[PDB]
Each structure stands twice: as structure tokens, then as C-alpha cells.
């Protein structure tokens with residue numbers, strides 16, 4: 001259905017590897033939204049037309065308040081256009097740059113929102129695999145929305161920064177839902193500390209740190225946080241808590257908010 005002439009394009013919202021995302025308004029209804037614009041050539045060269053379909057299939061059909069809606073799509077001679085829900089307060093990545101580190105209640109709140117959203121996804125055998133702060137968007141209430149479903153896959157199943165990926169994944173092995181639990185632990189640490197726990201100056205060093213699960217806490221991280229993170233960041237996937245154990249963890253319950 002949709003054509004480019006249906007939209008007034010405005011301000012650029014962000015760039016990814018593939019997406020060049022703009023603010024946009026639909027002329028008839030004046031509906032503000034975001035258009036994610038991708039180049040067919042690029043997609044063709046990098047060979048990710050599958051990721052495009054998954055992203056469209058998965059994301060058009062989920063419905064949860066902490067997951068970003070994709071409303072539709074259309075294409076040009078030259079480009080593909082995804083019609084997305086607009087997240088007006090930007091990324092958790094920009095929040096963290098601006099704030100440096102989050103206190104325990106913002107952190108806990110975000111983890112709660114992530115863990116419900118992921119609970120919902122996993123309910124449908126969907127694993128996201130790319131839960132990074134630049135793909136975590138903020139709605140008008142400051143509520144966290146998971147975006148960028150191009151990496152998602154039905155579970156189980158067999159590029160850029162490695163920081164959020166678990167051992168089983170950077171090493172090739174089979175993985176399932178528990179990937180998203182490891183990433184939740186990396187996010188929890190990053191929110192509190194301000195850098196992810198396996199950060200390094202090189203990919204190869206990072207790879208080592210993840211496979212050795214080589215991380216330490218600064219002094220200011222508290223015992224309840226250390227406990228949640230240590231549990232999520234276990235090498236062995238089967239040893240990572242389910243999402244309900246996360247949601248009930250005394251540190252989450254002590255520090256997070258309800259809707």
C-alpha cells in the first residue's frame with residue numbers, strides 16, 4: 001500500500017549500519033512516525049534480506065507496550081522504507097552518554113521493562129539476540145521499547161561489537177532464549193557502571209574476556225546488583241535464571257517501579 005509521497009519527512013533520528021531513520025508525518029492523518037530507510041544495494045551486498053523479512057514479520061505482529069511497533073512498509077526502485085512507531089525520547093545509549101551511569105532504580109526499572117518485554121517474546125519462541133542500548137528506545141513516558149528485530153530468530157538456532165553477546169553465540173554453538181538473559185546481565189552492569197563488563201580496545205581481547213567471563217565490579221556496585229549480574233552472566237546457559245526469577249529478584253523488587 002504505502003508510497004513515499006504519503007509522507008512529509010523531517011528530522012534525522014539516527015543511523016545504524018543499515019537503517020537511516022527519519023522523523024516523518026503521514027499527510028492525510030498527520031500521524032507522526034519514524035521511517036527506517038534501507039538501501040537495496042547495501043542489503044543485497046551484505047546479504048541480509050532475510051533479516052529484513054524477520055524484522056518485518058516479527059515486529060509487525062508483536063504487541064507489547066515495551067516493544068516498538070512496525071506498522072508497515074513499502075519500497076522504491078532504490079530503497080526499502082519501514083514505517084515505525086516514533087520513540088520521542090531517543091535511545092538508552094544517549095541517556096547513558098548524557099548521564100554516565102544510572103542509579104539503581106532507573107536501572108531496575110529498565111531491567112523490569114526489558115524482562116517483561118523479553119518474557120513476552122520468548123513466550124512466542126522469539127529471541128532478539130541484539131539487545132544493546134542503541135536498540136532500546138524511550139517512549140513519551142520514558143518507558144523502554146525494544147527495537148531492531150533484524151537479528152531475531154525462532155529458537156533454538158545456530159559482525160559488529162561483541163559486548164552484549166554470550167559465549168555460546170560468539171563461538172558458534174546452538175543457543176536459545178538464554179542469549180537474551182546474558183545480554184540483560186551485560187545491560188544491568190552497563191547501566192550501573194557506565195561501560196559494559198567485557199569492554200576492551202579490540203574485538204579479539206573482548207572475545208577472550210567474554211569466553212573467560214572475565215569481569216569485575218567497582219566498589220559502588222551493591223551486593224544485590226552483584227548477585228543479579230553474577231547469575232545472568234554465567235557461561236553455562238542452563239544456569240542462567242528464567243525471566244520470572246529476574247522479575248522477583250530482591251534487588252529488582254526493592255528498586256524497580258510498577259506501571
Ligand SMILES: Nc1ncnc2c1ncn2[C@@H]1O[C@H](COP(=O)(O)OP(=O)(O)OP(=O)(O)O)[C@@H](O)[C@H]1O
Pocket residue numbers: 013014015016017018019020021034036051055068084085086087088090091134135137147148149150151
Ligand atoms: N522509532 C524510532 N524512534 C526514534 N529513533 C529511532 C527509531 N528507530 C531508530 N531510531 C534511531 O536510529 C538508530 C538506528 O535504528 P535501527 O537500530 O532500527 O537500525 P539498524 O541498527 O541499522 O537496524 P538492523 O539491525 O535491522 O540492520 C537507532 O539506534 C536509533 O538511534
Ligand SMILES: [Mg+2]
Pocket residue numbers: 016134135148
Ligand atoms: Mg540498531
